[PDB]
């Protein structure tokens, strides 16, 4: 039994050796009297050859794709090297072959990728229903193995930096991360529930109050919220906290860590330190707090330039933001971008061609009377086309910010590599419109900027937080902040967030008490690990870097969960379904 | 701000350096116009000294226990070194001291352990209620940091052996491990529930079906079952699976893994290979499938010595188990061990002292007629006491077995170090008496011995399983098996387990179907990581090696979980509370 090597590990150096391989029949080809079988295992393919003389022939004759076999043979040099395979120079002449398991015909192929050939995408629902076969594809294995490598690299780095890995509870008390809690009924007292954690937040802070100076965990978080390609109800974060630190210490720690991860997993060198943008200029220059820096097209305020201009939209509007495309837009594209701008609360979109001494279409007429001031502000050249969106403040920036992303796609602009950036100076709060009150921008335990303290009642929304987001290619891959460690301030900010003394006691009593026993200053961050890996593998969604993810409905096609349970069982938990 | 060293790191090599330390005031001593503060942080204590001529004095005068401070000073050599502290040869002469956070008086002290003194164990319900202060104690931090070291050692080793770490789902389908599932209500369709995993069993096997080749995971597990000192409702396993292996392969891999963990985490060299005992030998020699080998008192069959004895009990019993105690028992103790034997279905216990040349006490007169054969069989020596339990086979063994354990306590038998062993050749099944049918001894996917197959439908109960438990100091720290990879055999065993073709479909259909797509032979094991660590740290329960555990009722006195939730919340899940 015991194999001597991994099928896909055989190289020229192995010629002459008798080997025992174990794997799956990737493909069978009857070519002449000979039978060639491509044996695969996780390290790749290797060609097996059965001659009619050999006792292995009868078996090689009966074999089908995905059948599991034990193969014994002599490694020989291929008279015809196959450049597309790592084992390409060699092949195994078979002396024996045993079938260990047969396999029904798979609902989709898994063989192409192992030959370097392109794979037709199968329906996701189908891939999910037979995830165990989907995970046989090379791309899927590369993804999981990269996930492994990334986490080991994180452990190696934080361990060396002195971090203590601590596992926090899953059957706990509710954590406010902005989402709904998944509940777990407590059998001995119907009506009582545990909440799965939205994050380890309160526990990692308590670990700081406990004197473990620095902590980390590959934490699983649960949030019963609306799901999309960057959202699973059950996800992973690289959670981390440090004591006696200031914003700089955290960000500096994270960059060295991230660069260690990219060097180790991708062999890519990240230039340090990462660029930084205040929440204002990121919102100014890109209409978003997770800027995609794989391309320019920066937003520019040109509202002053149109304070007395022929058309009313750029005249009446608070701000008019404009950017410059390096290529022209078709009129179906222009129509699209226009649709984009209106999905973001803006009236519409405007544009004009930048000629070699003038302007051409759209609103070019109104640009001529300001040509040298407008072309100065935009830096627009001849052959570009300017895009404009007017209206309020936020809306002009967000709308022309979204159209900036769409345009980069349509104009298929070079978007390669990784571009990280810290978005800092976020505002402490955020206005909840569906409930006429303030809520947290990140979470309630986020510390206000040491100064904006007075303004904490004068003007709630002008308060700066010691928060920060880590973004990669326009995706928020991490978020954290320095925490409030003074118990007074925490209850103050708690009141501001609308919670009364009594709710504070039911929801965070234990934690406010913890702050009174000598909490040191602390802060941290949490990366969305699934997101970071999706990006590191150029995957279209995080589902591609999770072994067994859920579909958009939060369901598991593979197992059938969530599924019904016998009445006796629910009854035993003192629960019953109020169904229609 | 930034400190220059960890308070507890200062050594003689640091004399003469100016330093910045940050930490907690472990204790304050006003000793004669001199103030001594013991500063503590994760790495230990340092003695800070404040002289009245120092700008630090006023502040050192105002501080209290558990206050967080920043201290600056010059490291000096102590005139009189304190042998009990790693920083004992030094002290730091303060030049500055700042209070960063005051603390209120702690409900229990946390300072003793850091001085190497002994701590009075406070109420566990109290330690739990303020777990963040409890975790300030040195022993708790040594426990958590040892857990970290152990997990990192597992990752370094398995990574080097080629194992892929894969994170498996928590909102998933039920997995049978012998317990009740914890459920999570799916809100978009009342009556539909996810089950937290009792283990990753089925996913780890499907991952073998997917061709990864060896997998592992530090997996959080959930079992709603009666709790106790070695049971938490949510615990951690080192979960592992391998393909194309036989029992020997899995055991060798685990032995080297475990050796590595001990070498790295404790600096202890485990002698390999671990001894092995079949289930039957373990029951014969110790009356337990989880022997504590830290002492002898091995059980001996001695029934054939009393087939014609004056004493009815030894005469008409199927077996007579004896053991030798190296010291004498008091009358109360003999009474206790007697009570212990009775609580295990045995009619009673018998004893007798082994005299130089004879026997005295209890049943000594019936021993004299076989004195040399008996002393032969028990290797008893003068000064010993022989213990006896008679009755049907398993009862004799089990009862004397339990008496053995209790006797080692009472006799305070010298139990030191770590004694591992593999208990192999478990039976495939185990009879369920409150059901009147067979169940699984481990779990349903456990493979029957390759040939006891006929005895299957025919002789259920005589069937051996390729299953194995790993035991340490009489505690089951791990369990696994080679699995069934043939889908027909799995269904056969499913039927035998009292599960009809239709239940098989709802509960394991996705899995049975997976075994039909070419599953390779595979097997694995799971360690109870909390149990391993409780044992590695000499802890009285696994709660001592979990940062935030539940108490025996499964409640969290720190947090208050589980707790009630608003009617609105329960309504939206379509659920309602009722009487069981
Ligand atoms: N549903 C989801 N599916 C997948 N990934 C998700 C999902 N939700 C979030 N993420 C990722 O987790 C990162 C951190 O989450 P936050 O809630 O911002 O931080 C927290 O949980 C704070 N306790 C961190 C801290 O303050 O230190 C996000 O940036 C994102 O990439
Ligand atoms: N409630 C609990 N609290 C704390 N520790 C626990 C608890 N229950 C179990 N353990 C520990 O985990 C080990 C493996 O669990 P098993 O159920 O034997 O096997 C399994 O789960 C199989 N899938 C393993 C396999 O076959 O690979 C036990 O030996 C024990 O130390
Ligand atoms: N199965 C047994 N094994 C050992 N000692 C026993 C057993 N049953 C009874 N004894 C002992 O035999 C003696 C007489 O028991 P009793 O007849 O109950 O008075 C007492 O020493 C009991 O402890």
XYZ file of C-alpha atoms in Angstrom, chain A:
580
model
C 0.000 0.000 0.000
C 1.784 3.228 1.135
C 2.621 5.349 -1.936
C 6.248 6.368 -2.549
C 5.464 9.827 -3.993
C 2.734 12.263 -4.897
C 1.733 11.542 -8.512
C 2.252 15.143 -9.569
C 5.676 15.298 -7.891
C 7.588 13.074 -10.346
C 10.355 14.822 -12.243
C 13.198 13.786 -14.583
C 15.345 12.989 -11.582
C 13.036 10.019 -10.887
C 13.653 8.086 -14.095
C 14.546 4.491 -13.324
C 12.755 4.302 -9.991
C 9.968 1.814 -9.221
C 7.102 3.771 -7.705
C 3.707 3.323 -6.120
C 1.249 6.123 -6.826
C -2.286 6.576 -5.497
C -4.831 8.928 -6.980
C -7.719 9.623 -9.308
C -8.039 8.823 -12.995
C -8.091 12.312 -14.499
C -8.470 10.899 -18.002
C -8.191 7.642 -19.980
C -7.030 7.478 -23.600
C -6.941 4.324 -25.682
C -4.355 5.205 -28.313
C -3.354 2.237 -30.409
C -2.860 -0.904 -28.340
C -1.593 1.319 -25.590
C -3.662 2.784 -22.787
C -2.623 6.100 -21.248
C -4.061 7.155 -17.937
C -3.504 10.519 -16.365
C -3.223 9.894 -12.625
C -3.874 12.893 -10.445
C -3.519 13.839 -6.819
C -3.085 17.247 -5.193
C 0.427 17.845 -6.570
C -0.640 17.449 -10.219
C -0.911 14.919 -13.099
C 1.441 12.204 -14.272
C 0.983 10.013 -17.311
C 0.692 6.278 -16.695
C 1.145 3.832 -19.597
C -0.154 0.331 -19.837
C 1.108 -2.038 -22.539
C -0.922 -5.147 -23.417
C 1.931 -7.322 -22.185
C 1.660 -5.860 -18.660
C -0.589 -7.394 -16.007
C -1.923 -3.818 -15.491
C -3.571 -3.670 -18.924
C -6.826 -5.473 -18.168
C -7.415 -3.024 -15.338
C -6.342 0.083 -17.223
C -8.842 -1.044 -19.841
C -11.778 -1.043 -17.401
C -11.004 2.272 -15.653
C -13.081 5.473 -15.844
C -12.649 9.150 -14.840
C -12.598 9.865 -11.071
C -11.979 6.209 -10.247
C -9.425 5.940 -7.423
C -6.489 3.607 -8.179
C -3.160 2.326 -6.791
C -0.559 2.229 -9.551
C 2.889 0.563 -9.534
C 5.388 1.150 -12.287
C 8.782 2.195 -13.540
C 9.380 5.877 -14.204
C 10.722 6.388 -17.738
C 11.618 9.412 -19.831
C 8.922 10.593 -22.245
C 10.252 10.412 -25.804
C 7.952 13.409 -26.291
C 8.073 15.947 -23.435
C 4.798 17.730 -22.625
C 5.735 21.356 -21.757
C 2.361 22.074 -20.101
C 2.872 19.660 -17.181
C 5.326 19.697 -14.295
C 5.704 15.945 -14.772
C 5.912 16.525 -18.532
C 9.336 14.973 -19.084
C 8.279 11.658 -17.583
C 5.721 8.870 -17.458
C 5.215 5.649 -15.557
C 5.279 2.288 -17.318
C 2.744 0.210 -15.433
C 3.539 -3.157 -13.897
C 0.388 -3.169 -11.724
C -2.906 -1.268 -11.248
C -5.665 -1.757 -8.704
C -9.009 -0.003 -8.538
C -9.719 1.175 -4.973
C -13.015 2.856 -5.697
C -15.221 3.435 -8.686
C -17.002 6.697 -9.265
C -20.309 7.676 -10.852
C -20.050 10.195 -13.687
C -19.502 13.657 -12.227
C -22.083 16.387 -12.902
C -19.315 18.613 -14.291
C -15.692 18.125 -15.337
C -12.821 18.656 -12.921
C -9.981 17.572 -15.232
C -9.240 20.512 -17.442
C -7.604 22.761 -14.887
C -5.055 20.108 -14.031
C -3.834 20.163 -17.653
C -3.541 23.921 -17.539
C -6.491 24.150 -19.880
C -9.307 26.581 -19.362
C -12.437 25.514 -17.519
C -15.961 26.476 -18.549
C -17.685 27.886 -15.447
C -20.539 25.626 -14.278
C -23.549 26.968 -12.440
C -22.561 27.972 -8.904
C -25.601 26.275 -7.413
C -24.410 23.075 -9.088
C -20.809 23.593 -7.865
C -22.169 24.155 -4.418
C -24.457 21.103 -4.410
C -21.429 18.928 -5.267
C -18.840 21.111 -3.526
C -16.669 18.061 -2.747
C -16.191 17.497 -6.479
C -15.811 21.239 -7.158
C -12.968 21.227 -4.660
C -11.204 18.656 -6.883
C -10.472 21.408 -9.443
C -6.951 22.839 -9.353
C -8.045 26.461 -8.987
C -10.183 25.594 -5.960
C -7.302 23.758 -4.315
C -4.918 26.565 -5.050
C -7.373 28.876 -3.312
C -7.683 26.713 -0.175
C -3.908 26.089 -0.023
C -3.287 29.810 -0.364
C -5.744 30.355 2.517
C -3.673 27.936 4.506
C -0.396 29.654 3.623
C -1.774 33.103 4.492
C -2.956 31.990 7.941
C 0.269 30.170 8.746
C 2.161 33.332 7.734
C -0.042 35.409 10.031
C 0.640 33.002 12.889
C 4.401 33.074 12.193
C 4.491 36.844 12.101
C 2.300 37.627 15.147
C 3.882 34.897 17.190
C 7.263 36.467 16.515
C 5.844 39.924 17.342
C 4.726 38.602 20.711
C 0.981 38.268 20.141
C -0.994 35.764 22.179
C -3.588 33.816 20.194
C -6.745 33.586 22.308
C -9.948 31.703 21.425
C -13.069 33.605 22.449
C -16.638 32.314 23.031
C -19.188 31.441 20.357
C -22.168 30.882 22.711
C -22.153 34.354 24.140
C -23.754 37.757 24.634
C -24.726 40.034 21.758
C -21.934 42.160 20.151
C -22.948 45.334 18.210
C -21.349 45.322 14.751
C -24.381 46.762 13.007
C -26.057 43.471 12.127
C -28.735 41.120 13.534
C -27.719 38.225 15.860
C -28.112 34.566 15.090
C -29.623 32.986 18.223
C -29.090 29.590 19.847
C -31.819 28.301 22.170
C -30.759 27.361 25.697
C -32.572 24.137 26.513
C -32.816 24.300 30.326
C -34.764 27.526 30.337
C -36.956 28.170 27.302
C -36.899 31.860 26.480
C -33.158 32.144 27.156
C -30.798 32.350 24.185
C -27.103 32.547 23.445
C -26.101 34.808 20.625
C -23.425 33.779 18.115
C -20.809 36.547 18.092
C -20.855 39.293 15.492
C -17.190 39.736 16.405
C -14.870 39.117 19.417
C -14.784 42.911 20.142
C -15.746 43.052 23.835
C -13.686 39.913 24.589
C -10.464 41.192 22.982
C -10.792 44.456 24.956
C -11.285 42.438 28.147
C -8.180 40.529 27.224
C -6.393 43.942 27.215
C -7.891 44.855 30.615
C -6.544 41.402 31.726
C -2.990 42.333 30.961
C -2.317 40.176 27.935
C -0.625 43.051 26.124
C -1.388 41.922 22.545
C -3.932 39.409 21.201
C -5.021 37.815 17.857
C -7.387 35.160 16.573
C -8.617 33.870 13.251
C -12.147 34.560 14.520
C -15.364 33.295 12.949
C -18.017 36.029 13.000
C -21.760 35.630 12.529
C -24.114 38.244 11.221
C -27.656 37.618 10.167
C -27.701 40.364 7.484
C -28.351 40.833 3.751
C -25.973 38.613 1.779
C -23.948 39.346 -1.380
C -20.688 38.298 -3.116
C -18.646 39.953 -0.319
C -20.916 38.685 2.452
C -21.469 35.291 4.065
C -23.567 34.853 7.204
C -20.637 33.049 8.790
C -17.263 34.610 8.048
C -13.648 34.929 9.162
C -11.639 37.804 10.398
C -8.050 38.188 11.443
C -8.968 39.840 14.724
C -6.284 41.743 16.675
C -5.806 44.056 19.682
C -2.806 45.796 21.274
C -2.186 47.719 24.521
C -0.459 51.019 25.081
C -0.607 51.940 21.411
C -1.644 54.889 19.308
C -3.078 54.864 15.813
C 0.407 54.775 14.274
C 1.463 51.697 16.203
C -1.503 49.688 14.947
C -1.179 50.761 11.296
C 2.575 50.256 11.373
C 2.067 46.756 12.825
C -0.549 45.914 10.191
C 1.572 46.971 7.217
C 4.563 44.910 8.197
C 2.157 42.015 8.786
C 0.387 42.468 5.420
C 3.710 42.731 3.573
C 4.899 39.576 5.352
C 1.742 37.825 4.163
C 2.100 38.979 0.535
C 5.781 38.076 0.450
C 5.046 34.634 1.844
C 1.840 33.695 0.019
C 2.244 35.457 -3.312
C 5.927 36.303 -3.398
C 4.836 39.882 -3.979
C 6.635 42.813 -2.325
C 4.383 45.486 -0.946
C 5.996 48.930 -0.894
C 5.705 50.446 2.595
C 4.170 52.417 4.174
C 0.706 52.334 2.627
C -0.761 55.538 1.262
C -3.128 57.398 3.604
C -6.291 59.419 2.933
C -8.517 61.272 5.376
C -12.149 60.282 5.159
C -12.834 63.705 3.629
C -10.363 63.668 0.722
C -11.210 60.053 -0.012
C -14.862 61.165 -0.185
C -13.755 64.251 -2.124
C -11.362 62.720 -4.587
C -13.394 59.477 -5.176
C -16.908 59.686 -3.667
C -16.216 56.653 -1.487
C -14.406 55.640 1.718
C -12.903 52.568 0.005
C -11.146 54.204 -2.967
C -9.999 52.021 -5.849
C -6.488 53.382 -6.511
C -5.701 51.100 -9.471
C -6.513 54.166 -11.546
C -6.669 57.958 -11.550
C -9.820 59.746 -12.794
C -9.759 61.698 -9.507
C -12.822 63.793 -8.757
C -12.413 67.594 -8.886
C -14.668 70.302 -7.514
C -15.445 72.751 -10.300
C -18.593 74.262 -8.803
C -16.915 77.686 -8.347
C -16.195 77.708 -12.131
C -19.966 77.498 -12.796
C -21.320 80.045 -10.290
C -22.610 82.180 -13.181
C -23.021 79.736 -16.095
C -25.545 79.312 -18.882
C -26.987 76.101 -17.585
C -29.000 75.981 -14.366
C -27.842 72.537 -13.136
C -24.188 73.591 -12.720
C -25.480 77.004 -11.573
C -27.989 76.098 -8.854
C -26.059 73.059 -7.592
C -24.035 73.224 -4.343
C -21.150 71.313 -5.896
C -20.364 70.098 -9.361
C -17.766 67.378 -9.547
C -15.938 66.442 -12.700
C -13.294 63.925 -13.754
C -11.368 63.171 -16.953
C -11.593 59.917 -18.979
C -8.521 59.109 -21.156
C -10.741 57.495 -23.789
C -14.148 58.187 -25.324
C -17.446 56.728 -24.186
C -19.954 55.174 -26.617
C -23.477 56.556 -26.313
C -24.838 53.375 -24.766
C -22.025 53.626 -22.212
C -22.740 57.293 -21.575
C -26.375 56.168 -21.069
C -25.210 53.551 -18.570
C -22.953 55.804 -16.544
C -25.960 58.152 -16.544
C -28.097 55.362 -15.110
C -25.387 54.782 -12.485
C -25.393 58.437 -11.415
C -29.167 58.331 -10.930
C -29.058 55.172 -8.811
C -26.981 57.342 -6.466
C -29.484 60.200 -5.951
C -27.964 62.593 -8.555
C -30.194 64.252 -11.201
C -28.029 63.116 -14.089
C -24.583 63.037 -15.669
C -22.906 65.441 -18.100
C -19.941 65.177 -20.454
C -17.947 66.826 -23.258
C -14.960 66.019 -25.455
C -11.696 67.755 -24.822
C -10.462 68.777 -28.278
C -7.062 70.183 -29.307
C -8.124 73.773 -28.589
C -11.755 73.432 -27.530
C -14.675 71.157 -26.651
C -17.271 69.196 -28.662
C -20.352 67.367 -27.434
C -22.714 67.359 -24.498
C -22.195 70.560 -22.492
C -19.078 71.757 -24.405
C -20.783 75.103 -25.093
C -20.812 76.002 -21.365
C -17.222 74.847 -20.881
C -15.707 77.139 -23.541
C -16.393 80.246 -21.374
C -14.047 78.733 -18.731
C -11.836 76.443 -20.838
C -8.446 77.435 -19.385
C -9.636 77.386 -15.761
C -11.503 74.065 -16.199
C -8.680 72.375 -18.148
C -6.331 73.566 -15.391
C -8.497 72.075 -12.616
C -8.972 68.754 -14.458
C -5.605 68.486 -16.223
C -7.669 67.106 -19.113
C -5.768 66.620 -22.399
C -6.957 66.438 -26.037
C -8.589 63.057 -26.616
C -10.166 62.890 -23.154
C -13.804 63.344 -22.296
C -14.896 65.128 -19.126
C -17.712 63.640 -16.985
C -19.790 65.827 -14.663
C -22.387 65.437 -11.895
C -23.832 68.318 -9.949
C -26.076 68.528 -6.968
C -25.536 68.691 -3.246
C -22.203 67.841 -1.606
C -22.191 64.146 -0.726
C -24.382 63.142 -3.676
C -22.144 64.872 -6.250
C -19.154 63.018 -4.835
C -20.757 59.609 -4.255
C -22.600 59.506 -7.595
C -19.616 60.629 -9.715
C -17.650 58.281 -7.469
C -19.680 55.250 -8.515
C -19.667 56.267 -12.198
C -15.869 56.494 -11.792
C -15.785 52.758 -10.995
C -18.127 51.781 -13.842
C -16.167 53.884 -16.332
C -12.875 52.165 -15.390
C -14.624 48.896 -16.252
C -16.209 49.945 -19.529
C -13.042 51.680 -20.680
C -11.387 48.547 -19.410
C -8.663 50.514 -17.821
C -5.510 48.786 -16.707
C -6.268 47.561 -13.204
C -3.413 45.334 -12.106
C -1.728 44.474 -8.843
C -2.684 45.480 -5.362
C -3.257 48.970 -4.087
C -3.710 49.334 -0.333
C -4.595 52.484 1.539
C -5.545 53.591 5.031
C -8.720 55.717 5.212
C -8.358 57.599 8.496
C -10.098 60.364 10.426
C -13.533 58.822 10.002
C -16.332 60.637 11.843
C -17.362 59.166 15.209
C -21.069 58.916 14.363
C -23.385 58.519 11.372
C -26.988 59.644 11.052
C -29.680 56.975 11.042
C -32.514 58.298 8.842
C -35.055 55.492 9.459
C -34.645 56.276 13.204
C -34.114 60.034 13.641
C -30.976 59.596 15.823
C -27.206 59.001 15.690
C -25.588 55.584 15.556
C -21.961 54.517 15.491
C -19.853 54.805 12.340
C -17.828 51.674 13.290
C -18.962 50.471 16.754
C -19.831 52.043 20.161
C -16.420 51.434 21.734
C -14.577 53.551 19.194
C -12.724 56.453 20.803
C -13.468 60.048 19.800
C -10.472 62.120 18.772
C -8.944 63.378 22.069
C -10.037 66.927 21.135
C -13.502 66.790 19.516
C -14.580 66.001 23.074
C -16.298 69.391 23.650
C -18.050 69.139 20.282
C -19.538 65.831 21.509
C -22.878 67.567 22.175
C -22.467 70.915 20.491
C -22.202 69.187 17.128
C -22.487 65.346 17.214
C -21.552 64.884 13.548
C -18.386 66.991 13.503
C -16.666 64.632 15.915
C -13.577 62.798 14.604
C -12.871 59.188 15.598
C -9.489 57.467 16.044
C -10.877 54.957 13.496
C -9.319 53.620 10.304
C -10.249 51.276 7.484
C -7.794 49.192 5.481
C -8.748 49.062 1.837
C -7.465 47.046 -1.114
C -8.457 47.787 -4.697
C -11.680 49.504 -3.654
C -12.709 46.890 -1.079
C -12.657 47.421 2.681
C -10.484 44.525 3.872
C -10.174 45.662 7.441
C -11.397 48.044 10.091
C -10.394 49.093 13.586
C -9.822 51.953 16.032
C -8.295 53.049 19.292
C -10.827 52.291 22.024
C -12.292 54.313 24.831
C -10.662 53.027 28.011
C -12.112 55.614 30.422
C -15.371 54.217 31.783
C -16.973 57.668 32.067
C -16.505 58.529 28.423
C -17.843 55.131 27.368
C -21.134 55.680 29.231
C -21.260 59.259 27.896
C -20.908 58.112 24.278
C -23.358 55.307 25.163
C -26.002 57.910 26.173
C -25.306 59.867 22.941
C -25.963 56.704 20.919
C -29.435 56.721 22.473
C -28.907 54.026 25.114
C -30.076 54.688 28.646
C -28.357 53.764 31.901
C -30.556 50.671 32.155
C -29.968 49.290 28.649
C -26.230 49.885 29.219
C -26.493 47.543 32.203
C -28.263 44.720 30.342
C -26.181 45.016 27.174
C -22.768 46.244 28.405
C -22.855 46.321 32.186
C -20.142 43.703 32.575
C -17.949 45.619 30.134
C -18.428 49.091 31.666
C -17.472 47.486 34.994
C -14.377 45.947 33.438
C -13.277 49.486 32.427
C -13.276 50.506 36.092
C -10.626 48.067 37.214
C -7.752 49.681 35.423
C -8.095 49.368 31.634
C -4.931 50.403 29.765
C -5.092 52.419 26.595
C -5.694 49.987 23.674
C -6.796 49.602 20.062
C -6.778 47.120 17.233
C -8.318 46.057 13.965
C -9.976 43.133 12.260
C -9.368 42.091 8.646
C -12.079 40.381 6.609
C -9.895 37.355 5.726
C -12.275 35.910 3.131
C -12.271 39.285 1.323
C -8.538 39.639 1.427
C -8.136 36.115 -0.024
C -10.740 36.626 -2.693
C -8.666 39.621 -3.884
C -5.344 37.795 -3.487
C -6.655 35.075 -5.851
C -8.504 37.443 -8.190
C -11.761 35.664 -7.300
C -15.163 37.100 -8.257
C -16.561 36.482 -4.741
C -15.458 35.278 -1.385
C -17.278 31.989 -1.969
C -14.308 30.918 -4.054
C -11.914 30.992 -1.033
C -14.162 29.259 1.493
C -14.290 25.444 1.443
C -18.059 25.124 1.998
C -19.818 28.461 1.713
C -23.550 29.321 1.664
C -25.386 30.653 -1.412
C -27.091 34.080 -1.515
C -30.137 32.820 0.408
C -27.785 31.702 3.195
C -28.519 28.121 2.290
C -26.339 25.087 1.881
C -27.150 23.193 -1.350
C -24.608 20.521 -0.390
C -26.159 19.451 2.866
C -29.656 20.860 2.682
C -29.245 23.143 5.697
C -31.019 24.981 6.999
C -33.604 22.239 7.284
C -36.612 21.293 9.464
C -36.329 19.426 12.739
C -38.837 17.058 14.362
C -41.450 18.653 16.628
C -40.274 16.540 19.552
C -36.820 18.094 19.177
C -37.981 21.714 19.007
C -40.458 20.943 21.754
C -37.662 19.785 24.007
C -36.169 23.290 23.698
C -39.513 24.788 24.690
C -39.962 26.387 21.273
C -42.643 26.272 18.605
C -43.037 27.692 15.089
C -45.529 30.586 14.674
C -46.176 29.795 11.048
C -48.815 31.274 8.781
